[PDB]
Design a protein around this ligand. Structure first.
Ligand SMILES: CC(C)CC(=O)C(=O)O
Ligand SMILES: CC(C)CC(=O)C(=O)O
Ligand SMILES: [Cl-]
Ligand SMILES: [Cl-]
Ligand SMILES: [Mg+2]
Ligand SMILES: [Mg+2]
Ligand SMILES: [Mg+2]
Ligand SMILES: [Mg+2]
Ligand SMILES: [Mg+2]
Ligand SMILES: [Mg+2]
Ligand SMILES: [Mg+2]
Ligand SMILES: [Mg+2]
Ligand SMILES: [Mg+2]
Ligand SMILES: [Mg+2]
Ligand SMILES: [Zn+2]
Ligand SMILES: [Zn+2]
Lengths: 338, 338
């Protein structure tokens, strides 16, 4: 008998768990590896040399090997001879899916663990339980690799601009790839962070485009008063940067949008990626609500609907505004034409 | 044009993300809610009354309502009139799947965030970065609801015992349900924790079985020298308790297993659930490796293969040992007959 009862429970249990064990394990292995610096050396097209990577990362090589042997058992890498490991063929998709888990469970963990304090004294909780910006940045890039970054890339590229401006450039990755794909164009990577700009500047020298790529280390709010760098841009790009100005700096935000419209060359457009609040459709609703609740309740940053965004961009002077659904749940791309 | 490029990127992005956004959001909402005490009041068959639950949980009712309105938007609960919410029909499956994410990303977070310290000075890291046992316990119960708990329940029930002994009872939930399903039987819930035993004892009075259910507050290692409580048991149950004795207390472990064999009534068996290390098959391997790496590398607790378990149980005197694959990846149920 016992063989048969355990047989149905096994089948029923397999169905109930579904893909969650796999994703749970992938997310933990990949966050742990990324914190160690290992994940950046894993790629499906080349091998990681443990002897060299352990020295680059200042890890004891036996400890690094035990880690890679665990993720090899997990099936996320392939051992290609002693001391060499290569990521599994679909590694980048697995890493992308882990970005969602890392964002809600790791980047936003202070909100998960301390919700009571936020409900009691939001001001004290907001400056006591703060997010790790490196985890926010990495999980966002993982989520963006397949869910919003390619749409922006292909859109800017297709317009074939000659002057691109990226508000909140950070890594400057978007600029390097639009310059390397459209000939003769130039780019400007505005970003306030010192940390994001030294690492960006050297990668500008890496590609060898320092003549075409300016990096100014100012805030995006500085555009409201000093919109000089924008002059003549064919595409101005803004990825998930505007909602941090709302609702506290709405006037500055509306001024930056109006300066953006004024400063575009004819036929140019402003391409904004951002998150709309609490969608209802079955695909997007669950992650939408997580993005919306984290922002509304814990960060008190205003997410705007498509209607609000369209009205705000048309009040900034833009003739026509197109909204494009992104694969990233609750993410929208707004193309605001001059 | 831009409509069409964004159309393929959307479809491609939807495929790449798959179920990860949904699970990411579900896990964060449900861990946050469980930490608040809310999740225990959510059930698909009855409503949560915000006015009363906010008082029971000592939360400001407006804050609780904003939380439930977010998870309602997420689709995890249904508003059934003002102030009343009911969990979505498949809530228990979603909660089960979130148990895997909560276990690897939350319960085991000290290992994710501090792997460098463990690689450098394991002894210092092991007592510096310790897991939250409440999160370990809750995520384990969520994982077990559909992946290993029903198999043990149905197995013990089907044997129709008259004396059941649960090593590491903790919640005493397993005992209450085997006593409530087989008539005239008695149970013993051995567990070292004071915290786990006061809450268990009152629930014994809740069901009204305090005459049939003994609760002794001893360690399972105390069975190696004092196996008195086991005498005459038809089923002895041990859920994920033995690997914490290995490899440091192997002699005590082998003594408990031998005392278990000796103490069984004729036809009785010892039912052990535990985790085998690093499986290779495609379904189990990824989560297997996570369970195995957390235990081997960070907790230094020995997981045994089916072969090692069979040999150890036969060395303890058991005539025949059956191994049963559980839905819980890398989980196995061993039935060791007298
Ligand atoms: C929604 C993410 C893409 C980034 C973000 O806005 C945040 O984490 O605050
Ligand atoms: C494998 C889990 C079921 C429990 C466990 O063994 C642990 O978290 O240490
Ligand atoms: Cl004009
Ligand atoms: Cl005998
Ligand atoms: Mg089952
Ligand atoms: Mg099945
Ligand atoms: Mg499954
Ligand atoms: Mg290691
Ligand atoms: Mg979703
Ligand atoms: Mg895409
Ligand atoms: Mg598709
Ligand atoms: Mg999808
Ligand atoms: Mg709230
Ligand atoms: Mg698995
Ligand atoms: Zn944000
Ligand atoms: Zn364990």
């Amino acid at each position: 008998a016992t063989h048969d009862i355990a047989a149905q429970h096994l089948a029923d249990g397999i169905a109930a768990s579904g893909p969650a064990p796999d994703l749970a394990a992938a997310a933990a292995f990949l966050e742990m590896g990324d914190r160690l610096g290992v994940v950046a050396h894993l790629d499906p097209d080349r091998t990681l040399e443990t002897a060299e990577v352990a020295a680059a990362l200042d890890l004891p090589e036996p400890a690094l090997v035990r880690y890679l042997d665990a993720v090899e058992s997990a099936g996320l890498v392939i051992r290609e001879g002693e001391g060499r490991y290569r990521a599994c063929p679909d590694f980048d998709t697995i890493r992308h899916q882990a970005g969602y888990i890392s964002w809600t469970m790791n980047a936003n963990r202070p909100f998960i663990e301390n919700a009571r304090d936020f409900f009691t004294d939001w001001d004290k909780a907001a400056r006591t339980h703060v997010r790790d910006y490196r985890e926010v940045a990495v999980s966002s890039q993982w989520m963006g690799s397949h869910a919003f970054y390619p749409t922006a890339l292909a859109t800017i590229i297709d317009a074939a601009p000659r002057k691109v401006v990226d508000l909140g450039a950070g890594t400057c990755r978007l600029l390097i790839e639009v310059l390397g794909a459209v000939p003769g164009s130039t780019g400007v990577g505005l970003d306030f962070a010192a940390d994001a700009c030294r690492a960006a500047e050297q990668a500008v020298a890496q590609a060898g485009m320092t003549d075409r790529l300016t990096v100014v280390e100012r805030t995006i709010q500085s555009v409201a008063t000093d919109p000089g760098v924008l002059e003549g841009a064919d595409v101005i790009h803004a990825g998930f940067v505007f909602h941090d100005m709302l609702p506290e700096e709405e006037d500055v935000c509306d001024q930056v949008l109006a300066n953006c419209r004024e400063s575009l060359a004819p036929g140019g457009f402003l391409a904004i990626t951002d998150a709309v609040p609490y969608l209802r459709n079955d695909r997007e609703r669950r992650f939408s609500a997580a993005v919306s609740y984290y922002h509304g309740e814990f960060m008190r940053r205003r997410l705007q609907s498509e209607e609000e965004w369209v009205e705000r961009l048309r009040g900034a002077g833009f003739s026509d505004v197109r909204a494009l659904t992104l694969a990233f749940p609750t993410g929208r791309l707004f193309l605001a034409h001059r």
